[PDB]
Enzyme design. Structure first.
Site, PDB file in Angstrom:
ATOM      1  N   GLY A 121       2.431   2.456  11.197  1.00  0.00           N
ATOM      2  CA  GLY A 121       2.559   3.587  10.849  1.00  0.00           C
ATOM      3  C   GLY A 121       4.026   3.735  11.760  1.00  0.00           C
TER       4      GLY A 121
ATOM      5  CE  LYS B  19       0.086   3.223   4.223  1.00  0.00           C
ATOM      6  NZ  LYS B  19      -0.155   3.574   6.134  1.00  0.00           N
TER       7      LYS B  19
ATOM      8  CD  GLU C 260      -3.107   5.171   6.259  1.00  0.00           C
ATOM      9  OE1 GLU C 260      -4.005   5.748   5.290  1.00  0.00           O
ATOM     10  OE2 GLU C 260      -2.501   5.517   6.772  1.00  0.00           O
TER      11      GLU C 260
ATOM     12  CG  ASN D 130      -1.733   1.245   1.309  1.00  0.00           C
ATOM     13  OD1 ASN D 130      -1.717   1.779   0.396  1.00  0.00           O
ATOM     14  ND2 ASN D 130      -2.205   1.602   2.675  1.00  0.00           N
TER      15      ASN D 130
ATOM     16  CB  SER E  65       5.056  -1.174  12.062  1.00  0.00           C
ATOM     17  OG  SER E  65       4.470  -0.203  12.372  1.00  0.00           O
TER      18      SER E  65
ATOM     19  CG  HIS F 169      -6.245   1.066   4.959  1.00  0.00           C
ATOM     20  ND1 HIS F 169      -4.989   0.414   5.458  1.00  0.00           N
ATOM     21  CD2 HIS F 169      -5.482   2.225   5.641  1.00  0.00           C
ATOM     22  CE1 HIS F 169      -4.315   0.980   5.407  1.00  0.00           C
ATOM     23  NE2 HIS F 169      -4.156   1.951   6.219  1.00  0.00           N
TER      24      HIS F 169
ATOM     25  CD  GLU G  11      -3.763  -3.325   6.852  1.00  0.00           C
ATOM     26  OE1 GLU G  11      -4.354  -2.129   6.618  1.00  0.00           O
ATOM     27  OE2 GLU G  11      -2.558  -3.264   6.991  1.00  0.00           O
TER      28      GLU G  11
END
Lengths: 245, 246
Positions: free
Chosen positions: A169, A11, A95, A9, A209, A93, A163
């Site tokens: 991140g 992003k 985000e 991904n 991560s 996702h 996730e």
């Protein structure tokens, strides 16, 4: 056996110059026979990336909307993603959920629409740090998985991505046992609430991560079927993760 | 001497085949003197459309985010839009505000970032039907315009688009007087709160069911400097709109 699945991904990163260089490096990599590799470029580069990537790597969109065409400035549809030669979309996702406020209800409608249109779905779930610390991970992920499952029109075209939000991140990778524990439960949830076949055949991949240094011990867990990789997908170690097994 | 500005917002429509056909129609349009034409393809087709369109038509993105790069799955940055050869972005569109919940605060941050990065901005404002009927149109549009203005780093690169929500996609085109009344006020707002120069130079375009049948009478109003066109931008009528002052 479930085919090992590795998504990258990208992003909101990259321009044609640096992404073109990354793609050249990926096209020269050896994808194992037992692995499915997918890259998700920023939306402006779906077409560019599919043109540049070798067909051994699939392309995914990072998001989509829930109708084929319409009055939704700033959105793209599964039909557009297919038209650009991409074969997957990432939905739900972290985000999207937590920066852009996408609800479970909206994610379920997107899952239904994408699958009805024959586009593969990487459907993301995961708990926040405060939920993990409260001991309610299972409740949160099962609730998210139910909404996804209730909208799945073609299980052969779904990948479930666990996730944990506190691992995205942050450098705070889940331990192997931590990931396995959630994947095992999710698989049990699928067995009990959908079917044995669907539990056996659905890839449940871990994200958070994921790095070259953590990927092998995670991939060896029996219910961890691959990865969705953010930061390290832009790095040469993405190749090491592809080869994690 | 403000240049007449016509933007076409394709929204979430089109595939390579039918947009290729639309682009052929646009490439054949004679763009009149002193007229600026911009087209905003769906995000997946910014690059495709810029490759296919003649340079006489500029490309816009339909939206962007507020940093150069980062962990924002599903977003794109002004740097990417520039890299694809686009020179504008549409920000604060009604659909973004009211379907996708983008706040004024977020739109202002996007405006600041895009302009800081040298990308042109078509900044949209407009009241809902219930606000108009409550008598608060001015309050709503002035509040939205202030948030935009407070973030404008370069007025030469802004177009203000007044798009009353009740006119978008509904067939309910504002009358010329309705549009001119709001545009005149907005221009007065710029004069009083920014400068005479900014009021004189800033294009204020109208959107909301603009069509070939309504465009000339709207364009003749003195404070209506062009259009942002949704549904009619997907048809050959868009060319009649480009020629609204002819």
């Amino acid at each position: 056996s479930r085919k090992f699945f590795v998504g990258g991904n990208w992003k909101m990163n990259g321009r044609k110059k640096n992404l073109g260089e990354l793609i050249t490096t990926l096209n020269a990599a050896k994808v194992p026979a037992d692995t499915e590799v997918v890259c998700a470029p920023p939306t402006a580069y779906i077409d560019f990336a599919r043109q540049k990537l070798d067909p051994k790597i699939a392309v995914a969109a990072q998001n989509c909307y829930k109708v084929t065409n319409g009055a939704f400035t700033g959105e793209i549809s599964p039909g557009m993603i297919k038209d650009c030669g991409a074969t997957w979309v990432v939905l739900g996702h972290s985000e999207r959920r937590h920066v852009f406020g996408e609800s479970d209800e909206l994610i379920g409608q997107k899952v239904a629409h994408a699958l009805s249109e024959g586009l593969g779905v990487i459907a993301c779930i995961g708990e926040k740090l405060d939920e993990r610390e409260a001991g309610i991970t299972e409740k949160v992920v099962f609730e998210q998985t139910k909404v996804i499952a209730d909208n799945v029109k073609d299980w052969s075209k779904v990948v479930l991505a666990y996730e944990p939000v506190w691992a995205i991140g942050t450098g705070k990778t889940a331990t192997p046992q931590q990931a396995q524990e959630v994947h095992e439960k999710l698989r049990g949830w699928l067995k009990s609430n959908v079917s044995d076949a669907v539990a056996q055949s659905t890839r449940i991949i871990y994200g958070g991560s994921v790095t070259g240094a953590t990927c092998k011990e995670l991939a060896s867990q029996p219910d961890v079927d691959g990865f969705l990789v953010g930061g390290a997908s832009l790095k040469p170690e993405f190749v090491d993760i592809i080869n994690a097994k």
